[PDB]
Design a binder for this molecule. Sequence first.
Ligand SMILES: Cc1cc2nc3c(=O)[nH]c(=O)nc-3n(C[C@H](O)[C@H](O)[C@H](O)COP(=O)(O)OP(=O)(O)OC[C@H]3O[C@@H](n4cnc5c(N)ncnc54)[C@H](O)[C@@H]3O)c2cc1C
Ligand SMILES: Cc1cc2nc3c(=O)[nH]c(=O)nc-3n(C[C@H](O)[C@H](O)[C@H](O)COP(=O)(O)OP(=O)(O)OC[C@H]3O[C@@H](n4cnc5c(N)ncnc54)[C@H](O)[C@@H]3O)c2cc1C
Ligand SMILES: O=C(O)c1cccc(O)c1
Ligand SMILES: O=C(O)c1cccc(O)c1
Ligand SMILES: [Cl-]
Ligand SMILES: [Cl-]
Lengths: 389, 389
Amino acid sequence: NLQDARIIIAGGGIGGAANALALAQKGANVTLFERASEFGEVGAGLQVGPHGARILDSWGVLDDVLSRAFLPKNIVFRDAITAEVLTKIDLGSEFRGRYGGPYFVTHRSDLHATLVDAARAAGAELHTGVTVTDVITEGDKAIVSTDDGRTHEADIALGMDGLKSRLREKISGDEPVSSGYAAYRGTTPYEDIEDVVGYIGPRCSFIQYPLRGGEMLNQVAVFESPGFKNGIENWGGPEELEQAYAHCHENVRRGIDYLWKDRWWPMYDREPIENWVDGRMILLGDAAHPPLQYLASGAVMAIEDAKCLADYAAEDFSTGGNSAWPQILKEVNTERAPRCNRILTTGRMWGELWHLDGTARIARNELFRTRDTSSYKYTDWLWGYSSDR
Amino acid sequence: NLQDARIIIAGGGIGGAANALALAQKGANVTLFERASEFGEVGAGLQVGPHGARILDSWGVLDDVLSRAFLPKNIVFRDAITAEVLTKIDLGSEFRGRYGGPYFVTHRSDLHATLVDAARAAGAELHTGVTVTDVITEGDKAIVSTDDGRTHEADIALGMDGLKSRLREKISGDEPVSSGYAAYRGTTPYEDIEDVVGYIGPRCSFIQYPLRGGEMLNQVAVFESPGFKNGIENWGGPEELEQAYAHCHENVRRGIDYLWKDRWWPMYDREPIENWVDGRMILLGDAAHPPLQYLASGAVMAIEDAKCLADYAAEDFSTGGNSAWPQILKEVNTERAPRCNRILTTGRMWGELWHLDGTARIARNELFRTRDTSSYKYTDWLWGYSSDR
Ligand SMILES: Cc1cc2nc3c(=O)[nH]c(=O)nc-3n(C[C@H](O)[C@H](O)[C@H](O)COP(=O)(O)OP(=O)(O)OC[C@H]3O[C@@H](n4cnc5c(N)ncnc54)[C@H](O)[C@@H]3O)c2cc1C
Ligand SMILES: Cc1cc2nc3c(=O)[nH]c(=O)nc-3n(C[C@H](O)[C@H](O)[C@H](O)COP(=O)(O)OP(=O)(O)OC[C@H]3O[C@@H](n4cnc5c(N)ncnc54)[C@H](O)[C@@H]3O)c2cc1C
Ligand SMILES: O=C(O)c1cccc(O)c1
Ligand SMILES: O=C(O)c1cccc(O)c1
Ligand SMILES: [Cl-]
Ligand SMILES: [Cl-]
């Protein structure tokens, strides 16, 4: 366990929250600083596969999350031009047995609030409206600076400040890499859908799934922005959606009418990095490994990061104390980097596979149609992973 | 049978020769005019699948052709970058039973000479060094003009003057369509090869097969020419081969050193046309349906054209006489156009599937690897076709 240890977390997204929970359940003294004036997430959906669900269950929050979630029966891929089914991934009891948990979908806002609340319950001290301005290591401590002029000492600091992480600059000068694709979301108060459906087409895709016991439908449009390639600064705006989808089936074109249009998510990732550690600071979540969303595992990775850190630290700290932290951070980095970096790189290829045109589309469609649906070789690496040693 | 009928064939390629044979075996009076001063073909290989082999057997020339041919055990597709096997088509006894004949490979020069000789044996009158300059229909005759000033009358004329057919201009003003790919051939006096091997890579492919009882190896390089896209008039020259293949496996790069470099075949086809008939002239072979070579069926199609024409004419002429010819030509066109035009259009897609790059290549490779190799659904339409009614 971790009662002698103090950890400061910079950032209160799903990642920071999950880490606060995991670490506080082990008895650690956790202080989290979130820049925003309140905790909150987008009132739209995310998908959480069993690689995340198993971990939420281990923290005792799964039943509660599920009470407000939806359990899809399948993931269904369809051709975006014809609407024909290409293949399904069955999410039933055989899937759940193999992977240790359900594939579920829920609101981001609810998952985030549930983690925050549980982190509070377990003894984590969460502070909104506080920005971390610097983190250094001096001797056997992380020294964290905040925007109110104060400095705080801890045994380690977690850099969990997202895709646009400034703390990542301590380790890497890289910039986000544009995919050239943008994402729009919508929910609409709810032919019928009880699955995650993904329509995959030339330079575009469209995803639908139910939320909250089937009352609402989550919709997401991902498309190649011509403005990006043309050098537009604020690229992927909604003027682009009609042409992006014009070649698709009616089922998909109808969907576009529900998207929220006042806001969108231009899709960027970063090139994978092996080293996440700077003294007694470690980058986790998107600050370390921000993906493109095709594997629906960014938030999941962050949740995995939390389980790994807390587990490995509870294992090592009880025998080595606060002197052990640099070895613990190294071990966590060693475990997590190959996993997450494969998700980054594979995710790029997987999205490219969605968006193929011409003959490449014809080959892709046939590949998906003819597969051995009883094999798990395309998904075990993702859903069957665990950090447990 | 056809003894009261006279047919003039314009062109003495594999097509014209096959037609002369088929028609002469039915008792027709055949006159063929070939522009070149002698009969002859390239001393390199072609492939003849059972859709052609069955027909050669029906004319009694297969055993003889095979005595000088090679019988590959498989068609083997390999990745051109890694050299790894993607899939095989087994050409064994189950294949031969299903399709009515062997898949064989031989020299073009030998197949052509064997057809000519058999056409001579069966009573066809072949004339070298004579160019057909015009063909018209007047009343119930085709009137054919030749370059020595003479005109010749026949019941029908076959326009078999190849890819650059001038007689096709009577029906269509289309021009050949560049694929942007060029082909090089080589033979070399013969790790070992007893199959047709096709290495398929990004913007390039490389084909190898044995000839003449395994003594010689036929090699063919097909690649995307950057000069074509850059507007070079005589595009696809040998200065382009080193860069075209630089990214490929050694097995393929070694092969390029054997190609004959003083001559190449820039690959063109034509858009499919439904109507091949102008009065009492019909376009057959490449004049009607010149393909890109990925289905290895251009000469085969021409041989099929000959069987169909001779069969349908022998069926109808015995009851309707020379008055029947326009109906016979219509029926032949009706049968052959959908078949051949599917080969044209599918052949384009099939070559595109060979030459995919990036993620599309990854999907293609997996498609080929995981297929049900006992299914014949991808090949029955090609190899199991017959004109017999
Ligand atoms: C369209 C889309 C769909 C997606 N769908 C899925 C999905 O279905 N499933 C999935 O698992 N993932 C998905 N993801 C990925 C997922 O949203 C992210 O990977 C994840 O939310 C990252 O969590 P995080 O806590 O690391 O970073 P963020 O969520 O970015 O949180 C960072 C937090 O740090 C705060 N902050 C920043 N700087 C400072 C500072 N200096 N001091 C203090 N606080 C600071 C920010 O205000 C913010 O709250 C999706 C992403 C997109 C864009
Ligand atoms: C690289 C490559 C590889 C190929 N491989 C294969 C394969 O493995 N299998 C396969 O089945 N096919 C293959 N083909 C296709 C095949 O070569 C052709 O489809 C076929 O030879 C066409 O035969 P043809 O008689 O219609 O036309 P051609 O062979 O073009 O014959 C036309 C003849 O007409 C003569 N002529 C022209 N104008 C006149 C005139 N006015 N008067 C008199 N005579 C005239 C010409 O001199 C010529 O001999 C390949 C083609 C290429 C380019
Ligand atoms: O919001 C999602 O669930 C999602 C999942 C995958 C890709 C994407 O753009 C979005
Ligand atoms: O010469 C061949 O056998 C051949 C077959 C297919 C494609 C190609 O370019 C050549
Ligand atoms: Cl994601
Ligand atoms: Cl051909």
